Design a protein around this ligand. Structure first.
Ligand SMILES: CCCn1cc(-c2c[nH]c3ncc(-c4ccncc4)nc23)cn1
Length: 335
């Protein structure tokens, strides 16, 4: 019933309107008749593939456990009464106005707006990391905003407990560790992504675009300068590490040269987030306490996860995952 595709969510949810489609599934807005408000609904069809089943169950488990102002919640979940009839899952969430991707594509943000958006991203990230979770895919299109500039992080399908390469729409926010296929990356990958997002808010253009990870790395080296051997002490492809060390030397571009109109405090924080070496990268608590954010900083108002996360699903056959998804969504069935 939308774009020639079945969106079977009535009778509670009616007046459907298309929002978007992508790897995450298809998202519409709908009128919730029980709550008398419009909501967002994501349709997902994961049961054929083992990795989609993983991500679906992971997203559901995480978001049902999380509760934070700057993290999207799950309001309801629609699926068939029988596991045999279940082919699709519809996840109902708060309807926001837009995402940061669309906002940045056409709108200018004042420094005060950039400051408040970044605070909310980091405040949410603090909660996620406190739950021992890596998001792993932060980017402008999964930062949702409403009219009053409130921000929520969504899209936790790629998330993981903190102890690829499928298709993705964009790789521009991925830390160097990730796209050098390093094994043993940590929370600091999310800080890199946030740094990339901050840069994009400052200029309305991606800081490290590129057609493949090699082109992206050239962009990164073109700004940060050549990496030392210590920057590359991870377990990574030796030929890839050797290629990087072999490139013509690049000097660091001063941040104020790239961003001549930015707040100097913003750029000082930006610098600490976009450090090549992940060990030297600022952590989220320190970032929140940076002078750039001091007008918003409040440790008594930056909650952490009550029950930090402990699940493994990697090893499970999809039919066992399907079962677990069926069980996890049972509480939302009438009744
Ligand atoms: C890659 C993330 C896909 N995703 C978006 C949502 C979502 C939940 N509530 C929303 N409210 C509004 C919008 C939205 C976005 C753009 N333009 C308009 C409206 N999106 C959502 C969930 N998953």
């Amino acid at each position: 019933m939308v774009r020639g595709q079945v969106f079977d969510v009535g009778p509670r949810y009616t007046n459907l309107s298309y929002i978007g489609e992508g790897a995450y599934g298809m998202v519409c807005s709908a009128y919730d008749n029980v709550n008398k408000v419009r909501v967002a609904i994501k349709k997902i069809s994961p049961f054929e593939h083992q990795t989609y089943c993983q991500r679906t169950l992971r997203e559901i488990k995480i978001l049902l456990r999380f509760r934070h102002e700057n993290i999207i919640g799950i309001n309801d979940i629609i699926r068939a009464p029988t596991i045999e009839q279940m082919k699709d899952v519809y996840i109902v969430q708060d309807l926001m106005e837009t995402d940061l991707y669309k906002l940045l594509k056409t709108q200018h943000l004042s420094n005060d707006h950039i400051c408040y958006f970044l605070y909310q991203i980091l405040r949410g990230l603090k909660y996620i990391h406190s739950a021992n979770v890596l998001h792993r895919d932060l980017k402008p299109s999964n930062l949702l905003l409403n009219t009053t500039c409130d921000l929520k992080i969504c899209d936790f399908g790629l998330a993981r407990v903190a102890d690829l390469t499928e298709y993705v729409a964009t790789r521009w926010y991925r830390a160097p560790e990730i796209m050098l296929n390093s094994k043993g990356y940590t929370k600091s990958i999310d800080i890199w992504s946030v740094g990339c997002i901050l840069a994009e808010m400052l200029s309305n253009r991606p800081i490290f675009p590129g057609k493949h990870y090699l082109d992206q790395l050239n962009h990164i080296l073109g700004i940060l300068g050549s990496p030392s051997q210590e920057d590359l002490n991870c377990i990574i492809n030796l030929k890839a590490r050797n290629y990087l060390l072999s490139l013509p030397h690049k000097n660091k571009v001063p941040w104020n040269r790239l961003f001549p109109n930015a707040d100097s405090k913003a750029l000082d924080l930006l610098d600490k987030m976009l450090t090549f070496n992940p060990h030297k990268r600022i952590e989220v608590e320190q970032a929140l306490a940076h002078p750039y954010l001091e007008q918003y900083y409040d440790p008594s108002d930056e909650p952490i996860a009550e029950a930090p996360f402990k699940f493994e699903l990697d090893d499970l056959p999809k039919e066992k995952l399907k079962e677990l998804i069926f069980e996890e969504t049972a509480r939302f069935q009438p009744g």
